[PDB]
Amino acid sequence: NLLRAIEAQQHLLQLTVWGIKQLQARLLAVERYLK
Amino acid sequence: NLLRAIEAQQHLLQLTVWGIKQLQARLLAVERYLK
Amino acid sequence: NLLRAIEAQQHLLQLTVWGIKQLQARLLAVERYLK
Amino acid sequence: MTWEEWDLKIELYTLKIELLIKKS
Amino acid sequence: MTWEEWDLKIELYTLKIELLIKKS
Amino acid sequence: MTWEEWDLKIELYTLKIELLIKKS
């Protein structure tokens, strides 16, 4: 009920965690080239 | 009031999704500029 | 037990918000430097 | 997973949560 | 939507959840 | 305040939501 929405929000959450990790490693790569 | 909490967390998720898509487009633009 | 899941998801949400602000501040610094 | 799929899945799950919220 | 708005809204919604968490 | 803690923290809390999602 509400539990389904939480579990669905959990998967959305893990998708955002994936994106943040991708951005962090690529931004670190850009930052190091520039220095 | 569990549902109102869940509903407000869904707007938080939506705001993180927004921030992530903003960063990806701009970071991609940075990566293109330097190639 | 739905409440604790929500409490724990809120802790994850603040972690993703933290990571996004970190990336924004650093991507901005990069874009600013290259200009 | 590439970003095309990521975007896609974001849309699918959003619909579900909103759906669930309307019905919850 | 801008980063200023986004930020304001994070705070608004963060406060709400925390209030409501304490309450349910 | 490190990205190491961040990752660490994320895995900890994921574990815990999962435990509690299954238990309920």
How would you label D2-18 residue by residue, b for 16+ Cβ within 10 Å and e otherwise?
A: eeeebeeebeebbebbe
What residues contact D2, with CB distance under 8 A and at least 6 apart? none
Cα angle vertex C14, ends D9, C26, to 5°?
A: 85
How would you label E1-24 residue by residue, b for 16+ Cβ within 10 Å and e otherwise?
A: eeeeebeebbeebbebbeebbeee
**Burial tier of B6 (Cβ tally within 10 Å: 0-12, 13-18, 19+):** buried
Torsion angle defined by CA atoms of residues C31, C34, D1 and D5, in that order, rounded to the nearest 10 degrees: 50
Cα(first)–Cα(last) distance of chain C, in Å?
Answer: 51
Q: D24 at the B interface (CB within 8 A)?
A: yes
Which residue is it, tokens 């965690």? A17
CB B28 within 8 Å of CB C29: no
Cα(B15)–Cα(F5) distance, integer angstroms = 23
Number of domains in chain C: 1
CB B8 within 8 Å of CB E16: yes
Q: Looking at CA atoms only, how far is residue F10 from chain A in angstroms?
A: 8
Q: Which experimental technique did the depositors report for determining this structure? A: X-ray
Cα(D16)–Cα(D10) distance, integer angstroms = 10
Provide the residue count of chain B.
35
Cα(C11)–Cα(C28) distance, integer angstroms = 26
Chains contacting chain E through 3 or more C-beta pairs under 8 A: B, C
Q: How far is CA F21 from the centre of its chain?
A: 13
Q: C15 at the E interface (CB within 8 A)?
A: no
* Closest to A11 in 3D by CA, of C1, D13, D22: D13
Domain of C1 in residue numbering reads as 1-35
